[PDB]
Design a protein around this ligand. Sequence first.
Ligand code: ADP
Ligand code: ADP
Ligand code: MG
Ligand code: MG
Lengths: 365, 365
Amino acid sequence: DSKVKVAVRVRPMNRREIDLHTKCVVDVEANKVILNPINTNLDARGQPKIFAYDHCFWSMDESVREKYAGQDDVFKCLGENILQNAFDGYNACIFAYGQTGSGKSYTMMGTADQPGLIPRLCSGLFERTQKEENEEQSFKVEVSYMEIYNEKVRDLLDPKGSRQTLKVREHSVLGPYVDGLSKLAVYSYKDIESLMSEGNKSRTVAATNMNEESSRSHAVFKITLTHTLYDVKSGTSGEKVGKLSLVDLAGSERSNINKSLTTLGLVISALADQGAGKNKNKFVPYRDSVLTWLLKDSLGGNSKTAMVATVSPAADNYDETLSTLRYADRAKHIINHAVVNEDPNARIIRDLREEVEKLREQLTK
Amino acid sequence: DSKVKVAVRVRPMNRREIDLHTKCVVDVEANKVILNPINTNLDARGQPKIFAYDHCFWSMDESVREKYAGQDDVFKCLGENILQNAFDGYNACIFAYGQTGSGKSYTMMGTADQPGLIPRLCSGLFERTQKEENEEQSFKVEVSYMEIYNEKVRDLLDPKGSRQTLKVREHSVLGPYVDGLSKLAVYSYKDIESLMSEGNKSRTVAATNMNEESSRSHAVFKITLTHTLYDVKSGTSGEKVGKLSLVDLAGSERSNINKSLTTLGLVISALADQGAGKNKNKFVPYRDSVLTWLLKDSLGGNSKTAMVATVSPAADNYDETLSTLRYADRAKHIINHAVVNEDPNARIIRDLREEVEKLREQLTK
Ligand SMILES: Nc1ncnc2c1ncn2[C@@H]1O[C@H](COP(=O)(O)OP(=O)(O)O)[C@@H](O)[C@H]1O
Ligand SMILES: Nc1ncnc2c1ncn2[C@@H]1O[C@H](COP(=O)(O)OP(=O)(O)O)[C@@H](O)[C@H]1O
Ligand SMILES: [Mg+2]
Ligand SMILES: [Mg+2]
């Protein structure tokens, strides 16, 4: 049904890079990222490398106004389509990918000063449900917020704070799920903000003494939007469910602390190959890690998915940037199979009524 | 499908009645209530009047142990069947009826020292969902808590506390409902207790200066139990919904402050008549008051309903007791039509598959 949408975001030079006048090797021109060489005297390897994507966000300098992508520009190019996907009854996923320090969290959650995709999405969601609820349609919103570290799943909304690990299980009806994960109804922005906030503090309390290892953890924020449509002249109603998954991955740079990230690289490569008609018979190793298992639908399954690859423009990060740019490039060839999530009984009934009519007129003979 | 179940509960003498050695005119023998005369010299009107009910709770004296019904006895004879009705996917209603001071609130909600039907029901509900959840079945619980006074509906769980009044509307899919009423998910006893508690304080803050008028208000506490059954070998699932309505009516004794109570008396009388085959063509005046409108299903509709008629045993209350005893008597002839509340599409599909098979073998000719 659709291809994975890919955006790249170039963060500003950090404070060390400004002190040192570190050179910028990343240029953005419309939807092209140009990775310029570090070693300017080479006949290959010292040439610019040019990549094309669905979206490019140059976020290097607030001053350059004809070029700079702030937080709301990201939201208007990526967030709004994803919110519309959920309101249409599709599962939708945005995940941020890139080396530690390149801007994954700033993009997904942002700061109190510069809220990112998740709080903007939350606000717009409740704005829209408030404006569209009436006697033909109602809405229910649920939230889950989990962390994956060292292949163990924790509930960031846990009431206790034991930080105990949750089993991941397969279910013929639900699919892969986290057995025990809180799923909480929310009724306004402020409900979902208080959950966002408790989960973010549990991400940061998990990072107090283990700062190097908090760059190795994945965070998944999940909104379930249940749209009820009332067929008022037939006295019936039905549900369409869209699930919004906002994913803040572990740092992509160089025991099984990285099993999920590695497995994700494999999953992306296999799905990209398959989109280009290679290795069509090779099964995708979703099952080999907790993260790719839990998010199997988001990549090559029943989901409308966008990737925000985040990169440093600094010469010192060239190799990690190239690799991020290459994965994003592969990712834009992944074919997804998003369908509207409504009850199958209605289609079964329509088909059966059609078969009844076919039989009835066959009987006329 | 079922008749309205009726219990009577006889409260103990209050402090004034003990001071004055007020005589007891109510006796209980098995399921019979005997209303003995006040004027002992009369040839009718000064004879005992004997009524039979489904249950009789003599709650006059904790000391008499072979006879006394405490709060858990009430819950085991009435609460447990109602909880089982909800778990089976029926709507279920308990309402308390009787003069001010006779024990309606003590029976429905009780005191911190003697919790009544509602907290006991809540606790047992979450006990049962915790023990029965597994991979074939999950549960969702929602609560609403409203007050009706002078034909106006207020939300006892309102976050603001404006005490603003809510419109009651008709809906072809939902039925009569309160437009704007909070309906909140709860996940443990303590969630639903904090809501119970905020609602009870909003009942009592509404009674600070208006104590005589708080005896004129109705309170409705509503739990929605959504039972999901997972058909794991077919990869499908479905919902059964039971709604639990616990109703604490206004005082039954002698402008439209009493419109709902009067209309309820009419509704009970018409439905009792109809059960005994009288006035079969006379429509029941559900629509003439907010309370009977909102609870139309509980009386003569899709509900398993029990009435707790509460009475004073004191001679001074004879006339009000007789009238309470008479309404309870009428109420036990009300026929209800409770069905299991599941999705109708499954029956439509079964019938259509049967029709397909009938046609297919007719075609063999
Ligand atoms: N586009 C941006 N604009 C301004 N500041 C940014 C941007 N991206 C990142 N930062 C800052 O850089 C720091 C590291 O970014 P962060 O999002 O934590 O990276 P990651 O989560 O990928 O490790 C943060 O303090 C953030 O405020
Ligand atoms: N069965 C009972 N046992 C002990 N005390 C009771 C009983 N019924 C009522 N009471 C007490 O009598 C008082 C009035 O009862 P209440 O339930 O408020 O009556 P109502 O709600 O019908 O006006 C309460 O303070 C309650 O504690
Ligand atoms: Mg981060
Ligand atoms: Mg009361």
